[PDB]
Amino acid sequence: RSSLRIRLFNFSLKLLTCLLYIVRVLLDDPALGIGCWGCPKQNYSFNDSSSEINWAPILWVERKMTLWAIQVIVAIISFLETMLLIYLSYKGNIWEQIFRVSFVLEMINTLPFIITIFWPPLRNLFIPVFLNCWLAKHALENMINDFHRSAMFNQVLILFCTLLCLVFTGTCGIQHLERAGENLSLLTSFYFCIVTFSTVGYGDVTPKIWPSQLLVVIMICVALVVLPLQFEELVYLWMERQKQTEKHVVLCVSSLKIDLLMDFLNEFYAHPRLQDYYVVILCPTEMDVQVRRVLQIPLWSQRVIYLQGSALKDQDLMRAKMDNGEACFILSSRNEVDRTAADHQTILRAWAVKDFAPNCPLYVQILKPENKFHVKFADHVVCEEECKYAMLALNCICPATSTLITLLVHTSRGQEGQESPEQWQRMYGRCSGNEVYHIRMGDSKFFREYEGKSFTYAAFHAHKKYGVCLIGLKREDNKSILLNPGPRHILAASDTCFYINITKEENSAFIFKQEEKRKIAPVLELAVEYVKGYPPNSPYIGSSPTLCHLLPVKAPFCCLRLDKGCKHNSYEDAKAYGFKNKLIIVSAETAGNGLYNFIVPLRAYYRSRKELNPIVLLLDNKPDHHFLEAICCFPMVYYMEGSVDNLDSLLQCGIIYADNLVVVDKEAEEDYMADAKTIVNVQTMFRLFPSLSITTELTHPSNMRFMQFRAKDSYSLALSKLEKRERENGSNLAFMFRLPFAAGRVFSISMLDTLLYQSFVKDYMITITRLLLGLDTTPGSGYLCAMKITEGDLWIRTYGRLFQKLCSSSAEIPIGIYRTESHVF
């Protein structure tokens, strides 16, 4: 880097000799006397009447003995180093050096100092050393090419430099050229030129001689031809440019849309702890127009950073400060028609981030279960197909389970519908503020008093006292969370207790102070027939093995088809079968590992064998033999070719005597229109079979209002006003009061996104959800069930007394109630 040192020293000397020229003119007083270095110095005066101008003041300037030598030495070093570079670098051309305009200014401002050595009398001769500052500007430009010390900042700094040189040349030129007439000082000429460049033109000080007038004219032309070139360069940098704090998180997506961004921002910033965080979005695609408008909002302008780049490029991960991020959220693209390709992209992105920043927690959203074991290294992984079908299957067992999970994984204060005149809306919006929290039991004011007591005793009494629902615990010895360990489990101070409550125990410091404001058998302190086995052919790695009701012998693939008759049976539709129970018809496009996660919860060993519901898969495409091999061991699981829009196929399914119809059918530029085909197709069957229970999954929660649409219905139309009011108050649960959602008829997969975002603050949330869905089976962990409250159980007047009876007899823990009212339409 010695070359840059040479130019830096060359730049330093250029500004030094210009400043030394300023020192000269500051100590040069013409009124004392001006001459040719010695004898005959002549005093002079300016006559405005006489047009002739004496050139002796302009030609000759009095130069100190120390001053002339030190500038000559500086000029000699100036001349030596510039020729040192010229001879050092030819680069294939000996000519053209003088035509480029830096040599002519160099030599004309330097070699006069060399020739002044020969003759004493002309040592006091004027040489325009102020023009040398232009070369110093040039010497700065070549420095910018190598070292920064911010891409356009250099041009702006250069623009200021050429402005300074224009001003500097003006002051020295005017002060010296008017030293013959009106004898302007430097300070006055400096103010003279500043008001000239800004075109003010005051006129109080003006050039009174023809040379000075000409200098202003030629200089005004120079300014008007050199400044626009700098302006155009700044314009070029600006147009090409148009195309923070600590504790940030990176959000890696393939395409970012307004729905995904708002879902993340609402959930991420719903916590007070994560308010000092800013979000970096690494998305290869250009920013969406709707996304741009939201980012211009000044709540999100300082918080959300959008970077156009790829996680597979380490340069883009450096711009995102991935090595410093608190967390990484890799989210799959669901709009992509090829989900295997999308899953491959997120696997690579997870691998790319892990390779770049190993000590960065990964939060990966995986589409297909077969690709889940490639990102198993990630701290938190959510498989959409596993949870979607497990929730859809549980809705067939426990109604509105998806609605129950949706509200729990959503961060809310339970303030929705608190002004509503309807009692059910107030209690529904209040109970929706429940969440799942964890606390060390010894540190827990809710459960510390139950030391040495059974889990069910603590769960009941904490609910009876504070209204908290102890659902599970995690022992300090193991890492496994158990839902409802049972009455045999004995509580300890090291256990981490998982409870459902409106507010965190620490955040409930008011009720404990409010507690201080006040200041059935009892639960005990101390406690063809089917085989039962595991499905043989697991379809994918990571499939949690659940003990299920299994056929004694594998069913041949011909017997799994409800359409065609075979050797074993001539039945051609569900009527010829004559099932004892009501059918579950699943209208899916393709049969994969997701549909496997639908059949497993319905065939589990704890599910009643007499209440087993036949499962009819209404597939658009013929299932491959691997899926049939995975489901050939399950009793009363059949498939057929058809769709929800074909009424012939649905009547062939047994829709007449089907208790549930699950529509998972998959089909646009306008985002909300993706569900148009599914919504209308489901609506047609809502009108053909009004009593049928149809469960649907929609891409957008905003479309949940269209599931069972009664246009001539004031009540459902009034719910729009309530939903808009909740949306006015900034509630993230605004779709909540729509009737199809509240009854469990619809859920969106976008809630799974909120579950992943919650895991950044609740590392147990994913495990709890899968434990409820049965997606992961830990020995000694409970399962979600439902019981019907019939008229023989109405002597149990309240929900608390039911909690007592369950905890005293069967040790079951009620999560909540699915309530039904008469709402004639």
Give yes or no for residue 669 binding its own copies (CB under 8 A).
yes
Query: Which residues 6+ apart lie within 8 Å of 579 measured at CB?
Result: 614, 636, 654, 657
Q: Which is nearer to its own copies, 312 or 520 (CB)?
A: 312
Site string for its own copies, 185-204 (x = CB under 8 A): --xx-xx--xxx-xxxxxxx
Closest contact distance (angstroms) between CB of 677 and its own copies is: 6
Nearer to Na ion among residue 428 and residue 571 (C-beta):
571
Least distance from its own copies to the Cβ atom of residue 673, Å: 6
Task: Determine the Cα–Cα distance for residues 88 and 257; give it in Å rounded to an integer.
Answer: 58
681 scored as a contact of K ion (CB under 5 A): no
- The answer to whether 571 is annotated as binding is yes
Query: Closer to its own copies at the Cβ: 473 or 734?
Result: 734
* Binding partner at 618 among Zn ion, its own copies, K ion, none, C-beta below 5 to 8 Å by kind: K ion
Asked if 277 and 246 count as a contact pair (C-beta separation under 8 A), the reply is no
Distances (CA, A) of 683 to 128, 389, 643, 676, 694: 89, 21, 14, 10, 10
Is 579 annotated as contributing to ligand binding? yes
Total residues at interface with K ion (CB under 5 A): 10
CB of 571 to Na ion, least distance (A): 5
Q: Is 643 in the site for K ion (CB under 5 A)?
A: yes
Q: How far apart are CA 632 and CA 620, in angstroms?
A: 19
304: tokens are 């959300």
How far apart CA 216 and CA 31 sit, in angstroms, is 25
- Shortest CA distance to 409 belongs to which of 741, 89, 781, 769? 769
Interacting partner of 706 out of its own copies, K ion, Na ion, none (Cβ under 5 to 8 A depending on kind): its own copies
Cross-strand partners of 563: none
Q: Name which of K ion, Zn ion, Na ion, none residue 620 binds, using a CB cut-off of 5 to 8 Å depending on partner kind.
A: K ion
345 binds its own copies (CB under 8 A): yes
Question: What SS3 class is residue 252?
Answer: strand
CA distances from 199 to 193, 207, 220, 266 (A): 9, 15, 10, 54
Using CB under 5 A as the binding rule, the residues of this chain from 199 to 238 that contact K ion are 201
CB of residue 407 to K ion, shortest distance in Å? 5
Any binding-site annotation on 183? no
660 is in an annotated binding site: no
Please state whether beta strands 435-440 and 496-501 pair in parallel, antiparallel, or not at all (unpaired).
antiparallel
Binder among 568, 580, 625, 801 for Zn ion (CB under 5 A): 568
Beta bridge partners of 604: 548
Of residues 242 through 261, those in contact with its own copies by CB under 8 A are 243, 254
Of 313, 440, 448, 725, which one interacts with its own copies (CB under 8 A)? 313
Exactly one of 29, 146, 246, 355 binds its own copies (CB under 8 A); that residue is: 355
Of the chain, the end-to-end C-alpha distance in Å amounts to: 85
Binding segment for Zn ion among 96-104, 115-123, 553-561, 600-608 (CB under 5 A)? 553-561
User: DSSP class of residue 684?
Assistant: H
How many helices (H) and strands (E) would you count in the chain? Answer: 27, 18
Token pair belonging to 299: 């709540």
Helix (H) or strand (E) holding 174: helix 153-177
Query: Is 558 assigned a ligand-binding role in the annotation?
Result: yes
Query: Does residue number 720 form part of the binding site for its own copies (CB under 8 A)?
Result: yes
Q: Which amino acid, one-letter code, is at 685? A: M
Q: Which is nearer to its own copies, 358 or 421 (CB)?
A: 358
Copy the structure tokens of residue 730.
């900034």
703 binds, among K ion, its own copies, Zn ion, none (CB under 5 to 8 A by kind): its own copies
Q: Are 495 and 479 in contact (CB under 8 A)?
A: no
- The interface with its own copies within residues 723-782 (CB under 8 A) comprises 724, 727
Give yes or no for residue 31 binding its own copies (CB under 8 A).
Answer: no
Are 657 and 644 a contacting pair, CB within 8 Å? no
Q: Does 676 bind its own copies (CB under 8 A)?
A: yes
Helix (H) or strand (E) holding 196: helix 186-197
Amino acid code (one letter) for 512: F
Counting contacts by CB under 5 A, is residue 559 touching Zn ion?
yes
Name the segment binding its own copies (CB under 8 A); options: 105-113, 307-315, 576-584, 740-748: 307-315
| Residue 488 CA to its chain's centroid (Å) | 46
Least gap, CB of 650 to Zn ion (angstroms)? 23
Specify the DSSP class assigned to residue 34: B
Q: Residue 36 corresponds to which amino acid?
A: C
Single residue of 103, 512, 672, 818 touching its own copies by CB under 8 A? 672
Q: How far apart are CA 137 and CA 146, in angstroms?
A: 15
> How many residues are listed for the chain in this entry?
825
298 binds K ion (CB under 5 A): no
156 binds Zn ion (CB under 5 A): no
> Between 217 and 236, how does the x/- string for binding to its own copies read (CB under 8 A)?
x--xx--x------------
Nearest distance in Å: CB 549, its own copies = 40
Closest CB 340 distance from its own copies, rounded Å: 8
List the strands of the sheet with 304-307, edge to edge.
304-307, 278-282, 248-252, 328-330, 362-366, 380-383
In angstroms, rounded to a whole number, what is the distance separating the alpha carbons of residues 266 and 25?
A: 68
From residue 775, how far is each of 212, 368, 495, 584 by CA, in Å?
91, 14, 23, 20
Of Na ion, Zn ion, K ion, none, which one sits near residue 433, judging by CB under 5 to 8 A according to partner kind?
K ion
371 is a site residue for its own copies (CB under 8 A):
yes
Q: x/- binding map, residues 502-541, to Zn ion, per CB under 5 A?
A: ----------------------------------------
User: What's the rounded Cα separation, in Å, for the pair 645 and 409?
Assistant: 33
823 lines the binding site for its own copies (CB under 8 A): no
Binding characters for its own copies, 136-155, by CB under 8 A (x = yes): --------------------
Closest to 554 measured CA to CA, from 642, 625, 610: 625
**Residue 309, Cα to own-chain centre: how many angstroms?**
13
- The region of 138-146, 380-388, 716-724, 793-801 touching its own copies under the rule CB under 8 A is 716-724
Cβ at position 699, least distance to K ion in Å: 17
Residues engaged in binding Na ion (CB under 5 A): 571
Locus of tokens 């209040």? 430
Select from 101, 104, 108, 341 the one that contacts its own copies (CB under 8 A). Answer: 341
Structure tokens at 381: 């992984």
Pick the closer one to K ion by CB: 346 or 587: 587
Residue pair 396/602 in contact by the 8 Å Cβ criterion: yes
Q: Which residue has the tokens 């992209």?
A: 345
The DSSP line for 2-64 is HHHHHHHHHHHHHHHHHHHHHHHHHS--GGG-B-SSSTT-B-----SSS-----HHHHB----
90 is in an annotated binding site: no
* Cβ-based nearer residue to its own copies, 287 or 692: 287
Cβ proximity of 732 and 268 under 8 Å: no
**From K ion, Zn ion, its own copies, none, interface partner of 217 (C-beta below 5 to 8 A by class):** its own copies
Residue 561, marked binder: yes
Amino acid at 725: R
User: Comparing C-alpha atoms, which of 740, 175, 761 is closest to residue 438?
Assistant: 761
Q: Are 396 and 413 in contact (CB under 8 A)?
A: no
* By CB under 8 A, residue 77 contacts its own copies: no
The size of the interface with its own copies (CB under 8 A), counted in residues, is 75
Residue 200 marked in a binding site: yes
Interface with Zn ion by CB under 5 A: which residues?
558-559, 566, 568
Going by the annotation, the residues of the binding site for Na(+) are 407, 410, 432, 434, 561, 564, 571, 579
Interface with K ion by CB under 5 A: which residues?
201, 407, 410, 412, 433, 435, 587, 618, 620, 643
Going by the annotation, the residues of the binding site for Zn(2+) are 558-559, 566, 568
Going by the annotation, the residues of the binding site are 200-201, 407, 410, 432, 434, 558-559, 561, 564, 566, 568-569, 571, 577-579, 587, 618, 620, 642, 665
Going by the annotation, the residues of the binding site for K(+) are 200-201, 561, 564, 569, 571, 577-578, 587, 618, 620, 642, 665
